Design an enzyme around this catalytic site. Structure first.
Site, PDB file in Angstrom:
ATOM      1  N   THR A 185      -9.469  -7.137   1.210  1.00  0.00           N
ATOM      2  CA  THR A 185      -9.073  -7.142   2.615  1.00  0.00           C
ATOM      3  C   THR A 185      -8.866  -8.575   3.155  1.00  0.00           C
ATOM      4  OG1 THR A 185      -9.286  -5.440   4.371  1.00  0.00           O
ATOM      5  CG2 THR A 185     -11.073  -7.072   4.257  1.00  0.00           C
TER       6      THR A 185
ATOM      7  N   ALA B 176       5.184 -10.850   5.222  1.00  0.00           N
ATOM      8  CA  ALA B 176       4.683 -11.050   6.580  1.00  0.00           C
ATOM      9  C   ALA B 176       3.329 -11.776   6.668  1.00  0.00           C
ATOM     10  CB  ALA B 176       4.623  -9.716   7.299  1.00  0.00           C
TER      11      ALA B 176
ATOM     12  N   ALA C 210       0.815  -1.218   0.000  1.00  0.00           N
ATOM     13  CA  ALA C 210       0.000   0.000   0.000  1.00  0.00           C
ATOM     14  C   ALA C 210       0.848   1.268   0.000  1.00  0.00           C
ATOM     15  CB  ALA C 210      -0.975   0.004   1.167  1.00  0.00           C
TER      16      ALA C 210
ATOM     17  N   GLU D 260       4.939  22.578  12.407  1.00  0.00           N
ATOM     18  CA  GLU D 260       3.745  23.417  12.280  1.00  0.00           C
ATOM     19  C   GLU D 260       2.446  22.617  12.099  1.00  0.00           C
ATOM     20  OE1 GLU D 260       4.286  26.706   9.446  1.00  0.00           O
ATOM     21  OE2 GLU D 260       2.265  27.379   9.967  1.00  0.00           O
TER      22      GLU D 260
ATOM     23  N   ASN E 252      -5.294   5.219  -5.764  1.00  0.00           N
ATOM     24  CA  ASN E 252      -4.006   5.843  -5.448  1.00  0.00           C
ATOM     25  C   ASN E 252      -3.787   7.209  -6.086  1.00  0.00           C
ATOM     26  OD1 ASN E 252      -3.566   3.589  -3.891  1.00  0.00           O
ATOM     27  ND2 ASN E 252      -1.946   2.730  -5.182  1.00  0.00           N
TER      28      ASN E 252
ATOM     29  N   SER F 151      -0.179   0.703   5.088  1.00  0.00           N
ATOM     30  CA  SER F 151      -1.525   0.223   5.407  1.00  0.00           C
ATOM     31  C   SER F 151      -1.600  -0.174   6.870  1.00  0.00           C
ATOM     32  CB  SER F 151      -1.889  -0.987   4.547  1.00  0.00           C
ATOM     33  OG  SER F 151      -0.959  -2.045   4.717  1.00  0.00           O
TER      34      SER F 151
ATOM     35  N   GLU G 234      -7.220  -8.242   9.433  1.00  0.00           N
ATOM     36  CA  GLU G 234      -6.820  -6.838   9.336  1.00  0.00           C
ATOM     37  C   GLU G 234      -7.260  -5.931  10.499  1.00  0.00           C
ATOM     38  OE1 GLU G 234      -6.202  -6.662   4.477  1.00  0.00           O
ATOM     39  OE2 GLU G 234      -6.773  -4.845   5.563  1.00  0.00           O
TER      40      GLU G 234
ATOM     41  N   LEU H 174       7.253  20.553   9.303  1.00  0.00           N
ATOM     42  CA  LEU H 174       6.509  19.451   9.924  1.00  0.00           C
ATOM     43  C   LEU H 174       6.057  19.732  11.361  1.00  0.00           C
ATOM     44  CD1 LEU H 174       8.687  16.381   8.768  1.00  0.00           C
ATOM     45  CD2 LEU H 174       6.553  17.118   7.681  1.00  0.00           C
TER      46      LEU H 174
HETATM   47  N1  GTP Z   1      -5.467   2.468  -1.210  1.00  0.00           N
HETATM   48  C1  GTP Z   1      -4.677   1.383  -1.368  1.00  0.00           C
HETATM   49  N2  GTP Z   1      -4.810   0.359  -0.485  1.00  0.00           N
HETATM   50  C2  GTP Z   1      -4.045  -0.761  -0.594  1.00  0.00           C
HETATM   51  C3  GTP Z   1      -3.062  -0.853  -1.689  1.00  0.00           C
HETATM   52  N3  GTP Z   1      -2.459  -2.048  -1.561  1.00  0.00           N
HETATM   53  C4  GTP Z   1      -2.998  -2.668  -0.477  1.00  0.00           C
HETATM   54  N4  GTP Z   1      -3.950  -1.902   0.089  1.00  0.00           N
HETATM   55  C5  GTP Z   1      -4.759  -2.209   1.292  1.00  0.00           C
HETATM   56  O1  GTP Z   1      -3.881  -2.563   2.365  1.00  0.00           O
HETATM   57  C6  GTP Z   1      -4.367  -3.711   3.068  1.00  0.00           C
HETATM   58  C7  GTP Z   1      -3.396  -4.882   2.923  1.00  0.00           C
HETATM   59  O2  GTP Z   1      -2.084  -4.398   3.196  1.00  0.00           O
HETATM   60  P1  GTP Z   1      -0.835  -4.528   2.187  1.00  0.00           P
HETATM   61  O3  GTP Z   1      -0.137  -3.192   2.169  1.00  0.00           O
HETATM   62  O4  GTP Z   1      -1.300  -5.144   0.886  1.00  0.00           O
HETATM   63  O5  GTP Z   1       0.107  -5.604   2.949  1.00  0.00           O
HETATM   64  P2  GTP Z   1       1.705  -5.461   3.155  1.00  0.00           P
HETATM   65  O6  GTP Z   1       1.993  -4.232   3.981  1.00  0.00           O
HETATM   66  O7  GTP Z   1       2.371  -5.605   1.808  1.00  0.00           O
HETATM   67  O8  GTP Z   1       2.061  -6.703   4.134  1.00  0.00           O
HETATM   68  P3  GTP Z   1       2.130  -8.285   3.778  1.00  0.00           P
HETATM   69  O9  GTP Z   1       1.088  -8.856   4.702  1.00  0.00           O
HETATM   70  O10 GTP Z   1       3.535  -8.678   4.147  1.00  0.00           O
HETATM   71  O11 GTP Z   1       1.834  -8.431   2.306  1.00  0.00           O
HETATM   72  C8  GTP Z   1      -5.737  -4.009   2.481  1.00  0.00           C
HETATM   73  O12 GTP Z   1      -6.702  -3.399   3.346  1.00  0.00           O
HETATM   74  C9  GTP Z   1      -5.734  -3.362   1.108  1.00  0.00           C
HETATM   75  O13 GTP Z   1      -7.034  -2.902   0.724  1.00  0.00           O
HETATM   76  C10 GTP Z   1      -2.973   0.309  -2.612  1.00  0.00           C
HETATM   77  O14 GTP Z   1      -2.168   0.306  -3.569  1.00  0.00           O
HETATM   78  N5  GTP Z   1      -3.793   1.354  -2.391  1.00  0.00           N
HETATM   79  C1  LON Z   2      -7.478 -11.243  -0.848  1.00  0.00           C
HETATM   80  N1  LON Z   2      -6.595 -11.852   0.122  1.00  0.00           N
HETATM   81  C2  LON Z   2      -6.507 -13.201  -0.067  1.00  0.00           C
HETATM   82  C3  LON Z   2      -5.042 -13.711   0.351  1.00  0.00           C
HETATM   83  C4  LON Z   2      -4.910 -15.246   0.573  1.00  0.00           C
HETATM   84  C5  LON Z   2      -5.641 -16.072  -0.401  1.00  0.00           C
HETATM   85  C6  LON Z   2      -4.820 -16.918  -1.304  1.00  0.00           C
HETATM   86  C7  LON Z   2      -5.435 -17.726  -2.260  1.00  0.00           C
HETATM   87  O1  LON Z   2      -4.641 -18.540  -3.138  1.00  0.00           O
HETATM   88  C8  LON Z   2      -4.016 -19.707  -2.563  1.00  0.00           C
HETATM   89  C9  LON Z   2      -6.798 -17.731  -2.361  1.00  0.00           C
HETATM   90  O2  LON Z   2      -7.434 -18.548  -3.349  1.00  0.00           O
HETATM   91  C10 LON Z   2      -7.724 -19.890  -2.963  1.00  0.00           C
HETATM   92  C11 LON Z   2      -7.575 -16.932  -1.531  1.00  0.00           C
HETATM   93  O3  LON Z   2      -9.013 -16.981  -1.685  1.00  0.00           O
HETATM   94  C12 LON Z   2      -9.587 -16.046  -2.631  1.00  0.00           C
HETATM   95  C13 LON Z   2      -6.900 -16.076  -0.463  1.00  0.00           C
HETATM   96  C14 LON Z   2      -7.833 -15.299   0.293  1.00  0.00           C
HETATM   97  C15 LON Z   2      -8.252 -16.363   1.060  1.00  0.00           C
HETATM   98  C16 LON Z   2      -9.266 -16.359   1.969  1.00  0.00           C
HETATM   99  C17 LON Z   2      -9.677 -15.279   2.829  1.00  0.00           C
HETATM  100  O4  LON Z   2     -10.393 -15.722   3.977  1.00  0.00           O
HETATM  101  C18 LON Z   2     -11.779 -15.484   3.946  1.00  0.00           C
HETATM  102  C19 LON Z   2      -9.001 -13.939   2.988  1.00  0.00           C
HETATM  103  O5  LON Z   2      -9.254 -13.226   3.947  1.00  0.00           O
HETATM  104  C20 LON Z   2      -8.022 -13.450   2.006  1.00  0.00           C
HETATM  105  C21 LON Z   2      -7.686 -13.985   0.713  1.00  0.00           C
END
Ligand code: GTP
Ligand code: LON
Ligand code: GDP
Ligand code: CA
Ligand code: MG
Ligand code: MG
Lengths: 54, 334, 437, 428
Positions: free
Chosen positions: C179, C99, C12, C254, C228, C140, C183, C252
């Site tokens: 999502t 992560a 994000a 301010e 974005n 995020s 989260e 910053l």
């Molecule tokens: N607005 C916006 N939200 C994003 C974007 N990418 C991810 N998100 C949001 O951020 C959340 C997931 O966090 P990410 O930033 O994808 O995860 P990460 O920080 O890469 O951490 P990992 O778990 O290691 O992948 C979700 O709620 C997404 O909707 C983006 O490009 N723009």
């Molecule tokens: C959108 N976030 C996904 C991440 C993990 C995930 C992986 C995946 O491929 C192996 C997949 O297809 C079988 C997924 O289902 C669409 C997911 C997905 C899995 C389930 C979820 O729980 C309800 C969730 O929160 C996130 C996703």
């Protein structure tokens, strides 16, 4: 109602308009909790390898 | 199939609304904590308005307006009438009221009290009804609550035969579009014991409340006079109608109060929408002048009128937002 | 002149960083290779833009930006994208394994093995700074890296740079936008650990941006690019005063002074108008009065909440385009009479206004139309606590059954941290209610 | 986080496993010899997940073929896509397991396990970043059941931080080889509860019922059952095999699908259900796919979802369609069936979309459900187990291999524990 601190330039201008007056942990402490979590992981992995050995 | 939740089971009105919705076969009731609802029949205290309108694929509606308590608390209502330029300050239809705190505007309350002493006239006030200021100025500290000293209506309209006192209750529905719907049927909550002005200490003749006095059922069922009978009395005893002498002033007070709070409470551009049923409590004097006493956030309907009003709430407040697969209200135009 | 370092953590933060730095380059007239033809002092300077860009002998303008992700794929698109030359390879840090939407994995497990490397690449930018004022951190709430690693970084930055200000641009989780289920956990855990380390934080609810894109841009299913580009417009408005000549929000420090009287309550609401579709054939250009009035419509806010049922502590108006003080004051006077604006008794009822005459720059072939005038309002209202209440309720529901907890414990985190994070949030919600009612 | 190591054990494991590689090789445009012959760049962008790139240029599946009997693997090798597999990855004994868990786990299988693990290590070392392992096997026989679980235990010792994924075929009296299947299954479930992160419960009862009631096949063979398995296997792995909206790996799936470590047994589902050879003429609309994928008739596990509650749901839509229509329909199912999804996991249904459709269908939907209703599958096995065990029947096949009655009692208890654990979250 009162326009104060007016400052102008070529790029723009800024001001304030008032309507009414009024009536950290250490470097060692961070590394300690990180290593406390690493040891809890290492204990959980040791308990797993013990179980698998049995 | 629309979905609703019930979060106040002590509500007489919305218990009837819930069963009317289920009987259509197009509404399903969910458990209290299920977030996936269309309608919320919510709790009286601490209603979580911050959690509404955040469920994707659901239009969400609640039976309460956020901020409407500012009209519905006695202390809040006085502050609203005094500060708002729409109503401020010598209001013709609201009795002289002062906010009193226990340990405030009681230094300026005495200044108007001394005008009532110098100009030798009636000086009766309500809190329980007091004779003099200093005799019940320590009564707010006796109870430990923030209550209002309001001007007591010494010369009220008296029903015959009986020489009685009464209050009028009107039920008002404000929908999601902020249409103000006054229900055509109101109720007169009557006193049975004849009104006494010489000494104000007895509970029966002075207090107009339904629950306290239970004399009971002498003139009509449960001390409740309905609109057709009261109109008929005015035609015979005073040569006037209910709509002319009383109801026009009622319509003026309702509309003036709700148009005042419209910018603060309206859900017009919000992510969730609100309706609310209100209970307006009125008082009529000898000269046929209508006074506002109380506005109720959670009002209870009269026994005879439950079926019609609760169908009316379903009709214009619920079914307008969620349509299914003559009107009992008078729209107050603004 | 005082320089500013931007930190982009997780997917994000990185992709939003891309959107912002693209927009900054178009605004300052910096090309994709890093050449700025309008700049006359070659290989150095102390201009307003130099807060965000540094210079090399060849006349190249390089961002004071660090990109960090625990997985290569997203930053690899920065390494090979249209702005590949703009950044130094040392600024773009990638791990091997992410992560996995787990706060504890980002903070404790993978956090430990990379934290020292990141701070070294941050120090390499800080050594190029004649007078550092602090950091702008993009992440995020929801992702494992975004929540976990950020809070660890924010802890360390307080140790190494104690005199420096730290600002957050945070993405609050929305079920509508891709999502993960855990989260709410990640959001609460990162808010607790970061709360004392953050000076001013700008929350952006993906729900609000998604709906603005549907309603006002006519896009039926908004992608990350759609979201974005809109976010970067808001960020640009907020940062413009650091990058351009002016007298409001020049440093910053301010931002704390003008917007944050109470240190813990450091989450200003941002409201932006107008958002107009580029595909819209006929558009009647909106006036100063109309756009300022739109700053009080909930449908324009970065977080969906009701400012009428709350109190203000501070309010900034930031204009871009054809705007003069006379029109602003006339607009304010009209709005004050019609709308519910309540301030706290210990604050002046008033607005700090900043105008920049250059209208907002829009990315060519984007979704936002060119406008004559635009405004971003930054207001510290207690109404934003609605977002904490929503998030806390979701936390409460899952945690009552101890659902998903084992994933966090299995990374070395103790269960007690969940309840410690929630108590702090319960305290934060109470702070807002004391000030608010 | 790219490479997956695939293992197929026993007759059922290799037969469904070969069909999996047959289907996804067609999807990625790889011929029976090993060369690429497709038109899209999307077919090759995440091909390293399942395939090793050998200089040729040719693609070799990261697959290890395991059996205690040489029979089925010779049928695989001489089969349609048999010459794609690395010949060194064929690890086999000669004696067989005789539908005996003990032979697979303790005696015959123990002799062969080390050779398999050498091939696993050889494949794991080639991986830039190994994310985990997937196993195809039945729980009813000897090799896939006994040795397969022994393999899982030993892989977890050598790779304790990697994700273990299984496609586990459940035995049924309707499609039954031997009477000892409930014994072998119960022993295997004990192992799967402890040592896997994700298990796809593929019930043979359900596959038969789909073939009989819906596909209108009077006497279905294993081949008709395996058509349904491979089509589901393709669907569940779509997000791993193709570039899309999300970076999807096995760990992120595990974190989000599994709220409690033991409850990781998923109901698979597919829409629309097709018989092999028969062409689908009528295209399904988005509301039809959504209605069908949630229907109990389309579930690969013979459990009624209306008898339980959904903890988490994953859904994968395949083909060119409106993502708004997908979002609307998925929200519509939840909001009109909200009682069947746990309120104490907010937003527990997640949806992905991939542009590339499977072979012979214009649009399809794959369902992965973590429902508490899966207890019915385990209760069924437990009832069949107890019916024999109360009389110690057929037990000499196991005690002759070194096993004691105690281990059977312990396995019976552990599975009854899992059942009551699912019941805990069905009401409360
Ligand atoms: N607005 C916006 N939200 C994003 C974007 N990418 C991810 N998100 C949001 O951020 C959340 C997931 O966090 P990410 O930033 O994808 O995860 P990460 O920080 O890469 O951490 P990992 O778990 O290691 O992948 C979700 O709620 C997404 O909707 C983006 O490009 N723009
Ligand atoms: C959108 N976030 C996904 C991440 C993990 C995930 C992986 C995946 O491929 C192996 C997949 O297809 C079988 C997924 O289902 C669409 C997911 C997905 C899995 C389930 C979820 O729980 C309800 C969730 O929160 C996130 C996703
Ligand atoms: N779905 C399916 N099930 C099978 C197949 N072959 C065997 N089975 C089932 O698997 C069990 C026997 O296991 P099997 O794999 O033959 O034994 P192994 O060779 O010792 O692993 C019985 O429950 C059979 O119903 C197959 O090709 N497809
Ligand atoms: Ca310069
Ligand atoms: Mg990531
Ligand atoms: Mg067999």
């Amino acid at each position: 109602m009162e326009v104060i601190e007016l400052n102008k330039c070529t790029s723009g201008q800024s001001f304030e308009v008032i309507l009414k007056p009024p009536s950290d942990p250490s470097l060692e402490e961070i590394q300690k909790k990180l290593e406390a979590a690493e040891e809890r992981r290492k204990y959980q992995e040791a308990e797993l390898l013990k179980h698998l050995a049995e | 199939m629309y979905t609703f939740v019930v979060r106040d089971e002590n509500s007489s009105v919305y218990a009837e609304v819930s069963r009317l919705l289920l009987a259509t076969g197009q509404w399903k009731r969910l458990r209290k904590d299920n977030p996936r609802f269309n309608l919320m029949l919510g709790e009286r205290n601490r209603l979580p308005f911050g959690r509404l309108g955040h469920e994707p694929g659901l239009v969400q509606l609640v039976n309460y307006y956020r901020g409407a308590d500012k009209l519905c608390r006695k202390a809040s209502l006085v502050k609203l009438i005094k500060t708002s330029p729409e109503l401020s300050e010598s209001c013709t239809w609201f009795p002289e009221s002062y906010v009193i705190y226990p340990t405030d505007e009681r230094e300026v309350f005495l200044a108007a009290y001394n005008r009532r002493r110098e100009g030798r006239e009636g000086n009766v006030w309500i809190a329980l009804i007091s004779s003099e200021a200093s005799e019940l100025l320590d009564f707010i500290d006796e109870q430990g609550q923030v209550h209002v000293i309001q001007k007591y209506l010494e010369k009220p309209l008296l029903l015959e035969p009986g020489h009685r006192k009464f209050d009028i209750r009107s039920w008002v529905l404000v929908d999601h579009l902020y249409n103000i719907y006054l229900y055509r049927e109101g109720v007169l909550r009557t006193s049975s014991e004849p009104y006494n002005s010489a000494n104000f200490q007895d509970k029966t003749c002075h207090l107009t409340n339904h629950c306290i006095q239970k004399n009971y059922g002498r003139y009509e069922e449960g001390n409740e006079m309905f609109f057709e009978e009261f109109n008929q009395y005015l035609m015979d005893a005073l040569n006037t109608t209910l709509e002319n002498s009383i109801l026009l002033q009622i319509k003026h007070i309702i509309r003036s109060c709700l148009m005042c709070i419209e910018p603060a409470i309206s859900t017009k551009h919000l992510h969730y929408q609100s309706f609310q049923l209100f209970g307006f409590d009125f008082m009529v004097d000898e000269e046929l002048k209508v006074w506002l006493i109380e506005v109720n956030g959670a009002p209870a309907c009269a026994q005879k009128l439950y079926a019609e009003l609760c169908q009316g709430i379903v009709d214009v407040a619920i079914s307008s937002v969620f349509p299914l697969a003559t009107s009992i209200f008078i729209k107050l135009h603004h | 002149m005082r320089e500013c370092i931007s930190i982009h953590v997780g997917q994000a933060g990185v992709q939003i960083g891309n959107a912002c730095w693209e927009l900054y380059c178009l605004e300052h007239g910096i090309q994709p290779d890093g050449q700025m033809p309008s700049d006359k002092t070659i290989g150095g300077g102390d201009d307003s833009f130099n807060t965000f860009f540094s210079e090399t002998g060849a006349g190249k303008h390089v961002p004071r930006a660090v990109f960090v992700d625990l997985e290569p794929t997203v930053i690899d698109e920065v390494r090979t994208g249209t702005y590949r030359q703009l950044f130094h390879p040392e600024q773009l840090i990638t791990g091997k394994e992410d992560a996995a939407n787990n706060y504890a994995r980002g903070h404790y497990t993978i956090g430990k093995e990379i934290i020292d490397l990141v701070l070294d690449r941050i120090r390499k930018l800080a050594d190029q700074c004649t007078g550092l004022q602090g950091f702008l951190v993009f992440h995020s709430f929801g992702g494992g890296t975004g929540s976990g690693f950020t809070s660890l970084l924010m802890e360390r930055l307080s140790v190494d740079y104690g005199k420096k200000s730290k600002l957050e641009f945070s993405i609050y989780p929305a079920p509508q936008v891709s999502t993960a289920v855990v989260e709410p956990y990640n959001s609460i855990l990162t808010t607790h650990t970061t709360l004392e380390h953050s000076d001013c934080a700008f929350m952006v609810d993906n729900e609000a941006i998604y709906d603005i894109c549907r309603r006002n841009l006519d896009i039926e299913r908004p992608t990350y690019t759609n979201l974005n580009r809109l976010i970067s417009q808001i960020v640009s408005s907020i940062t413009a005063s650091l990058r351009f000549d002016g007298a409001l929000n020049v440093d910053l420090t301010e931002f704390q002074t003008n917007l944050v009287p109470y240190p813990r309550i450091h989450f200003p609401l941002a409201t932006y108008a107008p958002v107009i579709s580029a595909e819209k054939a006929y558009h009647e250009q909106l006036s100063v009065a109309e756009i300022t009035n739109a700053c009080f419509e909930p449908a324009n806010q970065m977080v969906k909440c009701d400012p009428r049922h709350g109190k203000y502590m501070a309010c900034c108006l930031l204009y871009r385009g054809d705007v003069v003080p006379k029109d602003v004051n006339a607009a304010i006077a009209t709005i004050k009479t019609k709308r519910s604006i309540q301030f706290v008794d210990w604050c002046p009822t008033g607005f700090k206004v900043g105008i920049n005459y250059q209208p907002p720059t829009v990315v060519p072939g984007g979704d936002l139309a060119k406008v004559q005038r635009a405004v971003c309002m930054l207001s510290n209202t207690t109404a934003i606590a609605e977002a904490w209440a929503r998030l806390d309720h979701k936390f409460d529901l899952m945690y009552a059954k101890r659902a998903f907890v084992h994933w966090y414990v299995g990374e070395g985190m103790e269960e007690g941290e969940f309840s410690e994070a929630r108590e702090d949030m319960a305290a934060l919600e109470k702070d807002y209610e004391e000030v608010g009612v | 986080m790219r490479e997956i190591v695939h293992i197929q054990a026993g007759q059922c494991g290799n037969q469904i496993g070969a069909k999996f590689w047959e289907v996804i090789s067609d999807e990625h445009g790889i011929d029976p010899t090993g060369s690429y012959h497709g038109d899209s760049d999307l077919q090759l962008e995440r091909i390293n997940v399942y395939y090793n790139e050998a200089t040729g240029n040719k693609y070799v599946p990261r697959a290890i073929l395991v059996d205690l009997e040489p029979g089925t693997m010779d049928s695989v090798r001489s089969g349609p896509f048999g010459q794609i597999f690395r010949p060194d990855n064929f690890v086999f004994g000669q004696s067989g397991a005789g539908n005996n868990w003990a032979k697979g786990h303790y005696t015959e299988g123990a002799e062969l396990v080390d050779s398999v693990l050498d091939v696993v290590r050889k494949e794991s070392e080639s991986c830039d970043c190994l994310q985990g392992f997937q196993l195809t096997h039945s729980l009813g026989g000897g090799t896939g059941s006994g040795m397969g679980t022994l393999l899982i235990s030993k892989i977890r010792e050598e790779y304790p931080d990697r994700i273990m994924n299984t496609f586990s075929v459940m035995p049924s009296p309707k499609v039954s080889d031997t009477v000892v299947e409930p014994y072998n299954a119960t022993l295997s479930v004990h192992q799967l509860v402890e040592n896997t992160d994700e298990t796809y419960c593929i019930d043979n009862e359900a596959l038969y019922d789909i073939c009989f009631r819906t596909l209108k096949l009077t006497t279905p063979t294993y081949g008709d059952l395996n058509h349904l398995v491979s089509a589901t296997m393709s669907g569940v792995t779509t997000c791993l095999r193709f570039p899309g909206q999300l970076n999807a790996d096995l760990r992120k799936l595990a974190v989000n699908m599994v709220p409690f470590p033991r409850l990781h047994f998923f109901m698979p589902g597919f829409a629309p259900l097709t018989s092999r050879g028969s062409q689908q003429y009528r295209a399904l609309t988005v509301p039809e796919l959504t209605q069908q994928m949630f229907d109990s008739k389309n579930m690969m596990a013979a459990c009624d979802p209306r008898h339980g509650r959904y903890l988490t749901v994953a859904a994968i839509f395949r083909g060119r369609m409106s993502m708004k229509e997908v979002d609307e329909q998925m929200l519509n199912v939840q909001n009109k069936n909200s009682s069947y999804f746990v309120e104490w996991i907010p937003n527990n249904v997640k949806t992905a979309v991939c542009d590339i459709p499977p072979r012979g269908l214009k649009m399809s939907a794959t369902f992965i459900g973590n429902s508490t209703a899966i207890q019915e599958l385990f209760k069924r096995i437990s009832e069949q187990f107890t019916a024999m065990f109360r009389r110690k029947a057929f037990l000499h096949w196991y005690t002759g291999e070194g096993m004691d009655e105690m281990e059977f009692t312990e396995a019976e208890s552990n599975m009854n524990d899992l059942v009551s654990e699912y019941q805990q979250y069905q009401d409360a």
